[PDB]
Amino acid sequence: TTKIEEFYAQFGKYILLVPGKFTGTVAAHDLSTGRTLAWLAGWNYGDTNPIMHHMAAFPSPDPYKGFEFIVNTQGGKNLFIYGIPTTVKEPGEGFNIYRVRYDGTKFNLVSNIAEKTGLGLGVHVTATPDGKGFAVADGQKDIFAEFDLATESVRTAFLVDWKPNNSDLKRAWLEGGTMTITRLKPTLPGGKYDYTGTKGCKIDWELVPGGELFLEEGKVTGTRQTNVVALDAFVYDPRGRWGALSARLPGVAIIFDRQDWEPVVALVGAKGEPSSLPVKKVASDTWEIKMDKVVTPAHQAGFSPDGKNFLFMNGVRQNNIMVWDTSNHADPTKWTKKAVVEDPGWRGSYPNTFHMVFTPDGRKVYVTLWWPSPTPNGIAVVDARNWKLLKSVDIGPDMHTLAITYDGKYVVGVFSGYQKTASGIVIMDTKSDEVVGILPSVGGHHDCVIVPKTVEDLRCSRCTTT
Amino acid sequence: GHMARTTKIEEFYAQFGKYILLVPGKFTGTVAAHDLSTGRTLAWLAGWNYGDTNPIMHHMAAFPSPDPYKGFEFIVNTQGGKNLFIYGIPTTVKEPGEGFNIYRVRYDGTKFNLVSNIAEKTGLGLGVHVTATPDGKGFAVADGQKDIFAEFDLATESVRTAFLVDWKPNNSDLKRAWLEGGTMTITRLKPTLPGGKYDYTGTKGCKIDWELVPGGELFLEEGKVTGTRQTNVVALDAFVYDPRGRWGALSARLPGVAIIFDRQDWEPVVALVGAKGEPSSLPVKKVASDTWEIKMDKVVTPAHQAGFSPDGKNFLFMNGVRQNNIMVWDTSNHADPTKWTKKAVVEDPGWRGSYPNTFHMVFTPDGRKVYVTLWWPSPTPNGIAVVDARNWKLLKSVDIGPDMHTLAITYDGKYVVGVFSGYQKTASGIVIMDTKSDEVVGILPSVGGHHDCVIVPKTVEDLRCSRCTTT
Ligand SMILES: [Cu+2]
Numbered sequence: 001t002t003k004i005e006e007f008y009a010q011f012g013k014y015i016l017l018v019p020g021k022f023t024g025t026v027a028a029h030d031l032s033t034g035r036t037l038a039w040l041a042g043w044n045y046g047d048t049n050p051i052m053h054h055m056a057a058f059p060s061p062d063p064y065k066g067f068e069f070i071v072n073t074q075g076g077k078n079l080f081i082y083g084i085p086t087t088v089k090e091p092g093e094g095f096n097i098y099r100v101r102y103d104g105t106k107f108n109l110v111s112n113i114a115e116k117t118g119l120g121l122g123v124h125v126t127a128t129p130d131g132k133g134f135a136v137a138d139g140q141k142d143i144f145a146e147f148d149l150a151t152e153s154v155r156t157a158f159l160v161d162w163k164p165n166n167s168d169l170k171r172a173w174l175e176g177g178t179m180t181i182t183r184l185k186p187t188l189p190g191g192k193y194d195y196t197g198t199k200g201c202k203i204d205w206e207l208v209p210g211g212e213l214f215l216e217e218g219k220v221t222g223t224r225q226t227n228v229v230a231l232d233a234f235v236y237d238p239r240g241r242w243g244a245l246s247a248r249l250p251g252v253a254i255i256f257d258r259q260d261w262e263p264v265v266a267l268v269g270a271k272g273e274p275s276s277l278p279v280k281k282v283a284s285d286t287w288e289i290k291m292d293k294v295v296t297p298a299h300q301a302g303f304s305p306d307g308k309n310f311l312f313m314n315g316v317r318q319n320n321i322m323v324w325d326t327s328n329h330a331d332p333t334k335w336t337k338k339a340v341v342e343d344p345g346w347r348g349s350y351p352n353t354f355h356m357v358f359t360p361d362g363r364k365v366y367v368t369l370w371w372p373s374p375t376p377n378g379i380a381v382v383d384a385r386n387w388k389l390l391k392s393v394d395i396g397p398d399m400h401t402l403a404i405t406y407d408g409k410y411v412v413g414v415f416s417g418y419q420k421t422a423s424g425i426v427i428m429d430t431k432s433d434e435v436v437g438i439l440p441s442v443g444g445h446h447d448c449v450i451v452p453k454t455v456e457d458l459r460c461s462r463c464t465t466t
Numbered sequence: 467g468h469m470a471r472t473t474k475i476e477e478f479y480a481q482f483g484k485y486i487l488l489v490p491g492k493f494t495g496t497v498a499a500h501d502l503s504t505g506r507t508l509a510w511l512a513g514w515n516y517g518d519t520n521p522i523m524h525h526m527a528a529f530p531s532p533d534p535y536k537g538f539e540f541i542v543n544t545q546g547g548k549n550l551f552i553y554g555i556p557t558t559v560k561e562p563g564e565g566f567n568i569y570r571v572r573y574d575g576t577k578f579n580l581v582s583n584i585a586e587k588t589g590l591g592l593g594v595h596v597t598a599t600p601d602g603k604g605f606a607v608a609d610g611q612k613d614i615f616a617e618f619d620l621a622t623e624s625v626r627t628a629f630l631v632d633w634k635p636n637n638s639d640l641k642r643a644w645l646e647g648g649t650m651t652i653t654r655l656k657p658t659l660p661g662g663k664y665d666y667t668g669t670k671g672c673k674i675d676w677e678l679v680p681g682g683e684l685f686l687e688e689g690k691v692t693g694t695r696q697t698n699v700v701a702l703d704a705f706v707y708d709p710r711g712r713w714g715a716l717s718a719r720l721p722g723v724a725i726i727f728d729r730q731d732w733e734p735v736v737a738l739v740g741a742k743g744e745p746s747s748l749p750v751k752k753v754a755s756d757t758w759e760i761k762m763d764k765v766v767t768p769a770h771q772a773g774f775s776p777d778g779k780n781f782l783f784m785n786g787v788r789q790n791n792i793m794v795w796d797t798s799n800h801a802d803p804t805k806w807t808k809k810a811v812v813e814d815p816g817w818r819g820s821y822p823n824t825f826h827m828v829f830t831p832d833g834r835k836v837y838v839t840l841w842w843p844s845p846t847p848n849g850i851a852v853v854d855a856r857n858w859k860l861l862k863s864v865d866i867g868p869d870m871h872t873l874a875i876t877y878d879g880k881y882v883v884g885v886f887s888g889y890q891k892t893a894s895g896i897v898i899m900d901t902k903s904d905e906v907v908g909i910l911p912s913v914g915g916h917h918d919c920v921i922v923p924k925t926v927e928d929l930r931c932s933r934c935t936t937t
Pocket residue numbers: 124232233299300354466
């Protein structure tokens with residue numbers, strides 16, 4: 001009685017790429033036809049714990065003829081935090097970083113960059129603004145690195161450590177501390193690092209949403225629980241030069257100079273706290289940030305497409321979107337808080353505002369509203385000129401990432417069932433801010449991307465935000 | 467004028483009614499349920515999460531539920547061993563997991579629950595078709611590497627019967643081991659281990675080291691399938707049920723025979739011969755208390771998919787490769803399958819090559835039409851044939867996509883729902899066809915290599931057009 005063609009025809013020619021989390025897959029879907037173009041199952045290749053996690057795709061002149069992406073995995077006890085009644089005793093170690101190419105017919109597993117480099121990193125993956133490199137961060141090890149794609153080599157790698165003022169676990173962040181940033185050097189032959197698999201972990205799983213409190217309360221296992229900062233992402237200024245490394249537990253975004261590979265300033269999320277704190281060089285490869293207190297954790301971080309705003313979402317002890325004026329491209333020490341988005345319905349840990357995407361023209365930003373079961377999860381629409389919440393829309397359980405078609409017309413998001421219940425791909429019209437439909441999805445996806453054609457597209461992809 | 471307005475998908479889903487599609491993923495390792503009324507995936511499960519290191523999720527059947535949205539149960543099985551290595555995936559795995567699990571899964575209105583591993587309990591690791599019995603209280607599983615099938619009781623998770631089928635070729639040369647005929651021996655198995663357990667877990671019992679893939683029946687002749695008992699394979703496939711009760715048909719791909727069994731006194735009763743130009747059937751002779759034989763002077767062609775019509779008065783068997791057709795028997799005599807006789811054969815000039823193979827099927831509830839997939843190797847688009855199931859004539863053929871597999875039907879008869887599977891590496895999807903117009907209404911995305919699909923039934927009448935009567 002009704003055909004789907006008009007539904008798909010409205011989108012134009014865009015490919016959605018998704019990781020599957022506990023499914024172990026990655027897949028590309030053609031939004032113009034409904035077909036899944038290709039998929040890959042990590043366990044087929046001998047990855048015995050393929051928790052396919054985060055990803056970024058590089059610009060392709062014609063995605064339908066080919067494209068490339070990076071996808072990483074988690075492992076270890078990350079298998080055990082979603083309530084699945086598995087009897088597995090010894091999970092695979094994970095922390096793989098895979099380069100995958102679509103060739104117009106199928107996916108090709110090109111390389112395991114974690115094995116090649118020795119850096120096993122399991123949290124966000126971001127493409128550089130020129131599309132020629134990528135970063136990966138890890139919040140169990142508190143390491144991040146930027147990689148060159150062509151040579152599959154490490155450009156830089158850093159370790160971040162917390163030395164708490166108060167050694168009591170419940171007070172280890174509230175009462176402040178010193179954050180130390182160390183540029184790593186490889187320790188193994190052939191310029192390799194020694195961080196494969198679970199090696200380097202301070203805690204046994206990535207902190208969950210609101211999970212700072214669970215860490216404080218003694219509910220997260222690991223060997224260095226009071227030294228974690230929970231690095232999350234290295235997001236890029238679309239204008240070049242700078243990246244921002246988010247550290248969830250201290251609620252700080254450390255700005256790095258990608259030319260000199262040095263941290264230059266530390267933005268402090270919390271409302272009522274300074275815009276930033278200085279970074280002091282204490283040795284050739286070591287810098288420190290000193291905090292008298294940590295008012296609140298923070299998570300989502302990123303830049304508007306023009307690079308003139310930077311956002312950091314406070315959570316847990318405050319629940320707001322902090323905005324800095326980053327218009328001065330020359331000097332990040334001058335970046336200053338300019339606005340804060342609040343709502344009477346945003347308090348505490350939930351909603352956890354842990355993904356976003358801007359419209360290409362910068363006028364709006366869409367923000368995930370995540371909650372534990374059974375509260376409906378959804379999407380907030382924020383006015384990114386006046387910095388005010390416009391609307392919230394309920395979607396389903398366990399809402400994750402938001403991408404946008406590069407013409408700015410449709411937001412495409414994923415929800416993931418807490419790895420056990422309802423999941424899907426949701427599409428929202430950006431003019432009406434209404435959901436136009438849900439498509440089925442066998443996936444627990446905590447990421448999604450639309451394959452870009454240009455470097456300009458990356459300004460609204462997995463580059464500037466997560 | 468091509469982008470004048472926004473379209474919502476609601477009207478598309480609203481047309482289908484309240485039906486849940488269940489799919490296994492083959493190399494994805496998943497099973498999933500999709501709500502055709504909303505587009506949401508209700509739940510999924512990934513076998514590797516539970517420690518199954520080679521979860522090649524193959525076939526499945528669901529049992530009737532008074533309200534599928536509140537809960538339902540199904541069986542899904544897996545393959546194992548070197549089956550990981552036969553779809554061109556460039557894996558470096560040296561020692562694949564043993565697999566051959568049979569899982570009972572319950573949806574509870576929110577999530578899937580892995581209830582039991584029936585293979586571990588019973589000792590029968592069987593990796594090919596799963597079929598529900600017509601009463602919805604038992605199920606069968608067959609395997610085409612081991613050439614064993616069994617019927618199981620759902621409530622007790624126990625084996626009602628198990629049989630081994632073996633080929634003794636007239637000509638010992640692999641190339642001619644089937645063409646020049648042989649003897650098929652059917653043996654009722656008895657368990658050999660404590661607790662009434664069989665000794666067929668994992669890869670144990672395999673005659674060949676991997677399955678005969680879709681379209682690949684003749685690969686064994688050519689020396690492209692390794693194994694220890696290559697010339698003794700029959701490649702059992704499915705045990706499909708007569709909806710009127712009592713009888714089941716066991717498909718044996720390489721001899722091209724469907725062996726009819728009496729489920730009430732577990733014995734084979736007649737062998738239907740697929741090939742066009744060959745007799746309707748051959749006798750089954752009892753040669754010991756637990757042993758029967760069928761003698762064949764020749765095997766003209768292999769066959770694969772099989773099924774009864776909803777009224778049980780027709781039986782279909784799809785000859786492949788050496789002949790591609792739909793062979794039809796008059797099974798109207800429910801008292802005596804030895805009287806079942808060939809009545810029609812569906813052929814087409816376009817089916818004269820090695821491919822397409824006439825493949826999986828689904829009947830309309832009213833029996834008026836049968837939909838039959840048309841399978842080809844890459845790169846030819848695979849499709850769906852629409853057949854008049856009263857006069858046995860091809861009505862239409864439609865192209866869909868690469869590697870087309872199974873078809874289900876909504877139980878009101880209005881929509882066929884099928885899956886295509888990319889040869890485990892390229893395009894995949896769920897396709898929906900309106901049975902009034904015989905037109906595809908749309909494709910939905912699907913991360914899956916599915917060789918099966920079912921719509922969750924509400925009643926035993928629904929099973930007449932589900933994974934019970936046909937493959
Ligand atoms: Cu994050």
